């Protein structure tokens with residue numbers, strides 16, 4: 001993978017083109033880094049491997065954990081840079097304290113620079129922080145790009161990757177404005193283009209970095225069945241995602257879950273940039289870690305992100321509850337993996353009744369029709385729990401017992417076994433009703449359903465070791481000159497934690513910004 005400049009010269013090759021800043025990828029991080037470089041007058045090229053910008057960032061809800069900024073001040077939030085620092089220190093400990101500090105301390109500058117652009121505006125949207133710890137916001141402190149009329153961004157609207165409910169069925173944007181990740185990437189692209197210093201390319205693939213005397217000076221890029229050599233005078237920012245789509249790297253690293261279960265765009269994030277970085281001496285960390293979530297198994301073997309659980313319960317292959325089904329998706333996923341004994345917890349079984357007329361009582365992204373799950377056998381239905389356990393192969397006495405015990409907890413209003421519905425996260429998706437506890441509803445109105453739940457992800461979070469300025473470090477702690485990484489190309493400062501909504505995009509955006517500031521020196 002690693003190409004030596006002297007070797008290229010020897011073969012008779014030279015630079016196709018030159019820029020100051022070369023950005024690989026086009027999620028929130030990449031485009032934030034692109035904008036930061038180009039807005040202060042550095043010639044910038046962005047390389048997107050696929051025909052659509054945005055990757056998983058486009059799929060996202062575009063909730064962003066950038067605390068203590070002018071956006072939260074407009075909402076009057078009771079929060080601060082120091083309050084957010086306390087929450088991270090309480091969850092993560094002293095491991096990566098310097099990167100924790102740079103994350104919360106730089107959020108305000110990133111947000112102010114971006115909002116100065118007429119294509120970008122954010123607003124606070126309530127979504128709770130995920131753990132009980134000092135500095136938690138029960139309402140959350142995360143911000144979101146405003147809905148975007150695609151007419152405002154010209155030809156860029158047709159180049160944004162569409163939402164999951166359209167993108168895995170050969171479809172483009174559904175009716176209405178661009179929202180969530182579509183609005184984030186549409187606005188960032190329009191900002192990057194407005195600088196007049198950036199080129200935005202699709203179907204341009206990083207293959208290898210180019211090194212001269214141990215310094216990264218550019219990269220080899222495929223585009224139009226041809227090879228190009230792009231020089232980067234100040235540096236290369238690699239924000240091209242993780243290993244989530246590469247089954248071989250995940251099996252080698254011991255990453256739980258599976259490439260086919262990842263909610264990454266199929267084929268996009270195959271660890272190309274992590275590989276390219278290792279090839280020039282970059283150290284790696286946390287490769288067995290990912291941003292986990294439970295997934296509803298699909299007829300085609302893929303998964304759907306299961307979030308905002310509103311009802312049902314979940315059993316292992318023994319027909320027993322083992323977790324709080326309302327847990328934030330990353331803690332849910334880690335509890336599946338911790339409980340899994342040669343396959344008792346992957347798959348798990350979501351059990352629910354006809355309270356939502358056949359629907360599974362959660363948000364599934366994307367949302368496959370019950371009838372297609374039932375025809376494929378991913379879901380099974382029956383008139384009794386007895387017959388449901390027979391069709392699923394679950395122990396019938398244990399499932400019946402599990403459901404009667406859960407139903408007693410819903411009648412009483414407290415789940416003494418797993419404490420479901422006693423957290424602001426659990427309550428956020430459960431509108432207070434006539435029940436003693438809105439997160440606990442009895443499973444008793446037939447027909448009954450079991451859906452197979454697997455260990456999905458929203459990307460992996462392991463990869464190249466970086467400093468507080470996004471510089472890729474070798475095993476000895478020294479910087480690889482000219483090379484930066486951010487987002488899921490870099491090992492997350494968050495370790496084994498998913499602190500709150502928007503940490504993936506927030507960390508990606510801050511370290512892409514800091515990498516561009518470092519290149520501008």
Ligand SMILES: Cc1cc2nc3c(=O)[nH]c(=O)nc-3n(C[C@H](O)[C@H](O)[C@H](O)COP(=O)(O)OP(=O)(O)OC[C@H]3O[C@@H](n4cnc5c(N)ncnc54)[C@H](O)[C@@H]3O)c2cc1C
Nearest residue numbers: 025027049055056057061063206241272487488502504505
């Ligand atoms: C339904 C859903 C909702 C989510 N909601 C949120 C949320 O609210 N908040 C949040 O913070 N996170 C959210 N996430 C997760 C979030 O989208 C990701 O964790 C994060 O955006 C990953 O960013 P990245 O830069 O690492 O990867 P990506 O955003 O995937 O960027 C990688 C890009 O680089 C391209 N690329 C890859 N290899 C190459 C190469 N060799 N050359 C050129 N280009 C290449 C890819 O095609 C892709 O376009 C959500 C995820 C899902 C599935």
Ligand SMILES: C[C@]12CCC(=O)C=C1CC[C@@H]1[C@@H]2CC[C@]2(C)C(=O)CC[C@@H]12
Nearest residue numbers: 060061063127307363500501502503504
């Ligand atoms: C849970 C989540 C993902 C990961 C992340 O980090 C931040 C959030 C909060 C916003 C959620 C989003 C998932 C998709 C959601 C449910 C929508 O369709 C509307 C709001 C949005």
